[PDB]
């Protein structure tokens, strides 16, 4: 199974910041990879375009993907409201890791997070399914607008998104 590549064009208060691209590990977590791929293209008629990074905690991660409620509580998968933890083969090994947010076991939806450091205490709890390919400096720049509790000081949006490969 070939790993696809998706991109986000990130905006700050409606101004372009830059592009982040992700390799999705379809070769290890195809179900989880395919959810994120399809939400990135919008091909199911919903997805990440126009949604925000609601939680940015410098030295840890950037969290987004609530495109249903836009308040950090919502989101949904292409398989329904929630899907099972596919596996925990991949670990939170350092900056750029892309992983599923959840509300405990088997509650994967659309919310995800991008690690800006190793978060090894999330190993076996959150499904890792990809990694930043290009634009790790844009993820670093997003930390400009975060805080200790994650509230953002500017609105950080996925102004556009899609598949590259």
């Amino acid at each position: 199974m070939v790993n696809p590549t998706v991109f986000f064009d990130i905006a700050v208060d409606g101004e372009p910041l830059g592009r982040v691209s992700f390799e999705l590990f379809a070769d290890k977590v195809p179900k989880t990879a395919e959810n994120f791929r399809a939400l990135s293209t919008g091909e199911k008629g919903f997805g990440y375009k126009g949604s925000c990074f609601h939680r940015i905690i410098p030295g840890f991660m950037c969290q987004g993907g609530d495109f249903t409620r836009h308040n950090g509580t919502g989101g949904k998968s292409i398989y329904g409201e929630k899907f099972e933890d596919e596996n925990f083969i991949l670990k939170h090994t350092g900056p750029g890791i892309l992983s599923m947010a959840n509300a405990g076991p088997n509650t994967n939806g659309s919310q995800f997070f991008i690690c800006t450091a190793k978060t090894e205490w999330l190993d076996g709890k959150h499904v890792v399914f990809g990694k930043v390919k290009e634009g790790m400096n844009i993820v670093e720049a997003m930390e400009r607008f975060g805080s200790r509790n994650g509230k953002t000081s500017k609105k950080i949006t996925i102004a556009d998104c899609g598949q590259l490969e």
């Binding site: 409620r69 950090g72 509580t73 509300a103 509790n149 994650g150």
Partner: peptide, 9 residues
């Protein structure tokens, strides 16, 4: 009514 687990507020 929604479930927004806290970090710290």
């Amino acid at each position: 009514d929604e479930y927004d687990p806290t970090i710290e507020d």
